[PDB]
Amino acid sequence: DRIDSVSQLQNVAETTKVLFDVSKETVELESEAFELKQKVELAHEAKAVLDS
Amino acid sequence: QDLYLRELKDTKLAPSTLQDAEGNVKPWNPPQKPNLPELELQGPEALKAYTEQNVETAHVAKESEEGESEPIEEDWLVLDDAEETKESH
């Protein structure tokens, strides 16, 4: 049973840090979508002025 | 046709007075040129965001939030917390 308690950790060290990075850097990539939302909202505002 | 030609005349030269000539209209007291062309031209922005819609107020996108690059204090507490959570794994 001690071996079994060690059994789960076998194929987990493979990607624990890989997940730590995948869920970190890709989430860090959200500033681009933020700034693009900013420009899209500016486009919506000006386009609405034009539509008015 | 005279009824067609006369109608065209009375509906064109008078249409000239209304639109094609800047004579406004004698039958109607307020000219639309002093009413629509500039003030009601703000009616478009009256329905829109006034001095703000055509302007498109400057709103630069800001930065997202992070840990202030703080591993002196957050890292050790995070490690202890994660190990405490591991106590019921």
From Swiss-Prot, chain A:
Protein name: ATP synthase subunit 4, mitochondrial
Homology family: Belongs to the eukaryotic ATPase B chain family.
Source species, domain of life: Eukaryota
Ranges in coiled-coil conformation: none
Modified residues (Phosphoserine): S5
Note in the entry: Present with 12900 molecules/cell in log phase SD medium.
Subunit structure, interactors included: F-type ATPases have 2 components, CF(1) - the catalytic core - and CF(0) - the membrane proton channel. In yeast, the dimeric form of ATP synthase consists of 17 polypeptides: alpha, beta, gamma, delta, epsilon, 4 (B), 5 (OSCP), 6 (A), 8, 9 (C), d, E (Tim11), f, g, h, i/j and k.
Annotated localization: Mitochondrion; Mitochondrion inner membrane
From Swiss-Prot, chain B:
Localization per Swiss-Prot or TrEMBL: Mitochondrion; Mitochondrion inner membrane
Stretches the record annotates as Disordered: 54-89
One record GO biological process: cristae formation
Domain of life of the organism encoding this protein: Eukaryota
Keyword field: ATP synthesis, CF(0), Hydrogen ion transport, Ion transport, Membrane, Mitochondrion, Mitochondrion inner membrane, Transit peptide, Transport
The keyword Transport is assigned to this record: yes
Biased composition (Acidic residues): 65-89
GO cellular component: mitochondrial inner membrane; mitochondrion; proton-transporting ATP synthase complex
Main location: mitochondrion
Other remarks in the entry: Present with 6140 molecules/cell in log phase SD medium.
Quaternary context: F-type ATPases have 2 components, CF(1) - the catalytic core - and CF(0) - the membrane proton channel. In yeast, the dimeric form of ATP synthase consists of 17 polypeptides: alpha, beta, gamma, delta, epsilon, 4 (B), 5 (OSCP), 6 (A), 8, 9 (C), d, E (Tim11), f, g, h, i/j and k.
Function: Mitochondrial membrane ATP synthase (F(1)F(0) ATP synthase or Complex V) produces ATP from ADP in the presence of a proton gradient across the membrane which is generated by electron transport complexes of the respiratory chain. F-type ATPases consist of two structural domains, F(1) - containing the extramembraneous catalytic core and F(0) - containing the membrane proton channel, linked together by a central stalk and a peripheral stalk. During catalysis, ATP synthesis in the catalytic domain of F(1) is coupled via a rotary mechanism of the central stalk subunits to proton translocation.
UniProt record similarity statement: Belongs to the ATPase h subunit family.
Protein name: ATP synthase subunit H, mitochondrial
Species per Swiss-Prot/TrEMBL record: Saccharomyces cerevisiae (strain ATCC 204508 / S288c)
Coverage span on the entire protein: 36 to 124 of 124
